[PDB]
Amino acid sequence: HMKVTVTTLELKDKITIASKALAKKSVKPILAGFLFEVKDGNFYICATDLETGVKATVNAAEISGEARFVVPGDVIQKMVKVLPDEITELSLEGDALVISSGSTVFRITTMPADEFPEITPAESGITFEVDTSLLEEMVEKVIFAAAKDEFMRNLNGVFWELHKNLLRLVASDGFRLALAEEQIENEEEASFLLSLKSMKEVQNVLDNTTEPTITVRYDGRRVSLSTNDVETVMRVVDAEFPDYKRVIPETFKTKVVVSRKELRESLKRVMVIASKGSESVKFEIEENVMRLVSKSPDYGEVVDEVEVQKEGEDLVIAFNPKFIEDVLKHIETEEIEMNFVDSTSPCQINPLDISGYLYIVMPIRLA
Amino acid sequence: HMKVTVTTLELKDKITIASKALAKKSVKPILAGFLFEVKDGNFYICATDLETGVKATVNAAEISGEARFVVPGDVIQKMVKVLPDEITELSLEGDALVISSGSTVFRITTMPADEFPEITPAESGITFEVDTSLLEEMVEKVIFAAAKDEFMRNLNGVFWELHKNLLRLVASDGFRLALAEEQIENEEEASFLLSLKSMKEVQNVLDNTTEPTITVRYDGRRVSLSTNDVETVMRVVDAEFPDYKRVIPETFKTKVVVSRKELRESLKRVMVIASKGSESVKFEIEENVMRLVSKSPDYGEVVDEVEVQKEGEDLVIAFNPKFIEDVLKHIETEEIEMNFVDSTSPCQINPLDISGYLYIVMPIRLA
């Protein structure tokens, strides 16, 4: 005996929410599956890779019996997205989970749960509530700049800094950096690094909750991010995030104000040549215009000249254009500023007249 | 001296049109480029891979001088799609093509044209005009079923059959077949096979002309497809297209009428399991319903039951579901028919009550 009646939308939502905490195929195939647990009229779906764990309480209409088993993560995810009816019925027949919805019946072979661990929340520590939409926005404005190389433990993630009524998120890959800061309600100071994999689950949670605010708790070792129905717990990265403030310049010698669309389009034009091999654009900043230049030995050259408002010194300075383009994608204002010191110094990019968001791109050596 | 002034839209259109006649990087890098030729106040852009050739006349505002050179195909294609101004100016500086448009200047290294061949049209033979949109539609309704394996010379293409006031196109890959037939104005009988690569250029031409009809001429060895400004010539495939009529059954024992959306959705559900390895769906056709069944040894089973109108015998029969799904994508009616003989015989799929279009899928062995 295990029987569950649940709306298909609920099952789909809870599976989706848990899905980015699953492990890969290798290193415990068991951890590449969801734990389904039915006990005492409660139905939980869990996933973990041992660094992030998610325990989702499923709000069902009927729950009887007792069961604890694992089902393969990929198949169950694909399956729930195509169940055709408003209601879904779950049961066991032999060693199979039987999933019935309308016209369709899936029978999915279960795995043992005896090595699937208990997922427990962070202990008492530092806690705050934040507006769900605000935190989502902050995460999305920085997460792209994190190192994708998991070996770079100290950059493969997003750094959280809390102060009195203030949260800042920072991410970097050593070539560029994104920073977001917003006023919130928070009592205590704290900071921690969460892995990129943990952060993608954070984003997944936020993109799939309708609740107005969420709770965060940090105990020195783990961070819980909780909604009404979903507990997510993440072990903090055991690495020291770089002293990133040393790459954020305190003054400028050159400032350029330029249309975000205008520069994006110019970057696209020069990438026709830059993508061929140089992976470089040289900015020649003059009083009223900036020329963007890219050269490929074997294919050709491009020069594109764009109108700008510029204060300070004329400057010739080179960048990876993809890194500049990534920033522009994440800025929402029509105009941006680019702030420079020297050909060898970082550039700060920010939205015009909007505080709280800033980007740093390191330059490349001039050809 | 070579100078050309042309609208950017014109240059873009003619480059795009010629682009699918280019050869790959290997085997004459020269043939992976466009021929630009300026002579006597005419500007032509050409491309060939020695089986398909395209000669596009560019309608420019100003053309002076004389030049004949090749430019690399990928870069020029990317470049023209991002020129920012209504007008584009072309000239030579050193061994470079200089392309100036608004704010942007590209300088692209040219290659020698002395080994780029003359592209000439088919000789007198069989000729007809066809409505551009009609032929486009016919091509799109069949081309997906062609063999993608170039070694299968006799199936790697689309077969054209002309009769008095009638054109039929056929494509097959040995597992499935698509056929389209429409009334046109045509005097003589003829048939020929054009390669899949040639046919993709045909489609490219049709998708990029605004002219109401196009001309086709066949001389026994080559087929020209001509618009006002663009001559495309293709060498016919030296292979015998199979006697495909032997897989088109003349009668049915079972006919099923079913919603195209309904079956597409059912196929998607069973593919959750079929994509895991079996690549198979078993249809159990009964009086009022059809059950679709897929099984994976290691992951599970799915059964989906859909409402159908069925005449004739109950039947159990298996297919590759991707092949059924491909057909449905190309049918535009809300309802389709599936027509069967035996578990070992082809299935004919067609739109309900629409002549001129039909699909054949061969079954797979029952598990």
Does residue B18 contact residue B46 with C-beta atoms inside 8 Å? Answer: yes
Which positions in chain B touch A269 (Cβ < 8 Å)?
Answer: 82, 84, 104
Does residue A65 contact residue A93 with C-beta atoms inside 8 Å? Answer: no
For residue A240, the 8-state DSSP code is: P
Nearest alpha-carbon partner for A225 in A286, A296, A158: A158
How far is the CA of A241 from the CAs of A133, A135, A151, A171, A194, in angstroms? 26, 21, 14, 9, 10
Angle between helix A196-207 and A8-18 (nearest 10): 160
What is the C-alpha separation between A140 and A202, in angstroms, rounded?
11
Second-level CATH architecture of A249-367: Roll (3.10)
φ, ψ dihedrals at B147, nearest 5°: -55, 135
Tokens coding B188? 């003589």
What is the C-alpha separation between B208 and A116, in angstroms, rounded?
58
What is the C-alpha separation between A166 and A130, in angstroms, rounded?
10
- The identity of residue B35, as a single letter, is L
Angle between helix A321-330 and A260-274 (nearest 10): 150
What is the C-alpha separation between B121 and B232, in angstroms, rounded?
7
Find the residue in A nearest to B275 (Cα): A75
What is the C-alpha separation between A157 and A146, in angstroms, rounded?
6
Taking the CA of residue A5 and the nearest CA in chain B, the distance in Å comes to: 19
Is the CB of residue B25 less than 8 Å away from at least one CB of chain A? no
Does residue A130 contact residue A114 with C-beta atoms inside 8 Å? Answer: no
What is the C-alpha separation between A110 and A90, in angstroms, rounded?
13
Helix (H/G/I), strand (E/B), else coil: A106: strand
What is the C-alpha separation between A114 and B5, in angstroms, rounded?
75
How far is the CA of A367 from the CAs of A303, A343, B108, in angstroms? 15, 12, 19
Interface of A with B in 280-309 (CB under 8 A): 298-306
Tokens coding A263? 């520069």
Is the CB of residue A265 less than 8 Å away from at least one CB of chain B? yes
Sorted by sequence, the CB contacts under 8 Å of residue B146 that are 6+ apart come out as: B155, B156, B157, B158, B171, B172, B173, B196, B199
* Burial grade of B300 (CB within 10 A; 0-12, 13-18, 19 or more): buried
* Burial grade of A197 (CB within 10 A; 0-12, 13-18, 19 or more): middle
Tokens coding B87? 């007008």
What is the C-alpha separation between A157 and A50, in angstroms, rounded?
16
Which positions in chain A touch B82 (Cβ < 8 Å)?
Answer: 265, 268-269, 272
> For chain A, what are the domain ranges?
1-120, 121-248, 249-367
- CB within 8 Å: B84 and A302: no
- The identity of residue A359, as a single letter, is Y
Does residue A272 contact residue B79 with C-beta atoms inside 8 Å? Answer: yes
Integer-rounded Cα radius of gyration of chain B: 25
Helix H, strand E, coil C: the string for chain B is: CEEEEEEHHHHHHHHHHHHHHCCCCCCCHHHHEEEEEEECCEEEEEEECCCEEEEEEECCCEEEECEEEEEEHHHHHHHHCCCCCCEEEEEEECCEEEEEECCEEEEEECECCCCCCCCCCCCCCEEEEEEHHHHHHHHHHHHHHCCCCCCCCCCCEEEEEEECCEEEEEEECCCEEEEEEECCCCCCCEEEEEEHHHHHHHHHHHHCCCCCEEEEEECCCEEEEECCCEEEEEECCCCCCCCHHHHCCCCCCEEEEEEHHHHHHHHHHHHHHHCCCCCCEEEEECCCEEEEEEEECCCEEEEEEEECEEEECCEEEEECHHHHHHHHHHCCCCEEEEEECCCCCCEEEEECCCCCEEEEECCECCC
What is the C-alpha separation between B26 and A86, in angstroms, rounded?
55
Is the CB of residue A84 less than 8 Å away from at least one CB of chain B? yes
For chain B, the first-to-last Cα distance in angstroms comes to 72
Please name the residue that has the structure tokens 């102060």.
Answer: A163
Q: Largest Cα–Cα distance of chain A, in whole Å? A: 78
Beta pairing, strands A52-58 & A42-48: antiparallel
Does residue B346 contact residue B273 with C-beta atoms inside 8 Å? Answer: no
Does residue B8 contact residue B86 with C-beta atoms inside 8 Å? Answer: yes
Helix H, strand E, coil C: the string for A109-172 is: ECECCCCCCCCCCCCCCEEEEEEHHHHHHHHHHHHHHCCCCCCCCCCCEEEEEEECCEEEEEEE
What is the C-alpha separation between A365 and A274, in angstroms, rounded?
15
What is the C-alpha separation between B336 and B338, in angstroms, rounded?
7
Do B1-120 and B121-248 share a fold? yes
φ, ψ dihedrals at A111, nearest 5°: -115, 160
Helix residue spans in chain A (DSSP H): 8-18, 73-80, 132-142, 196-207, 260-274, 321-330
How many Cβ atoms from other residues are within 10 Å of residue B140's Cβ?
Answer: 14
In CATH terms, B121-248 corresponds, of 3.10.150.10, 3.40.50.720, 3.40.50.2300, 3.30.160.250, to 3.10.150.10
- Give the angle subtended at the CA of A23 by the CAs of A20 and A28, to the nearest 5°: 155
How far is the CA of B138 from the CAs of B57, B167, B169, B209, B299, in angstroms? 27, 9, 7, 16, 41
DSSP symbols for A178-196: EEEEE-----S-EEEEEEH
What is the C-alpha separation between A343 and A320, in angstroms, rounded?
13
- Give the CATH number of domain B1-120: 3.10.150.10
How far is the CA of A130 from the CAs of A171, A196, A200, B1, in angstroms? 20, 20, 18, 68
What is the C-alpha separation between B354 and B346, in angstroms, rounded?
20
Sorted by sequence, the CB contacts under 8 Å of residue A52 that are 6+ apart come out as: A20, A21, A195, A197, A198, A201, A232, A233, A234, A235
Does residue B46 contact residue B119 with C-beta atoms inside 8 Å? Answer: yes
How many Cβ atoms from other residues are within 10 Å of residue A39's Cβ?
Answer: 13
Rama region for A262: left / alpha / beta (φ>0; ψ in -120 to 50; rest) = alpha
Which positions in chain B touch A96 (Cβ < 8 Å)?
Answer: 300
Nearest alpha-carbon partner for A248 in A139, A341, A163: A341
Does residue B71 contact residue B79 with C-beta atoms inside 8 Å? Answer: no
Name the CA dihedral angle for A197, A198, A199, A202, rounded to a multiple of 10 degrees: 130
- CB within 8 Å: B301 and A106: yes
- CB within 8 Å: B305 and A103: yes
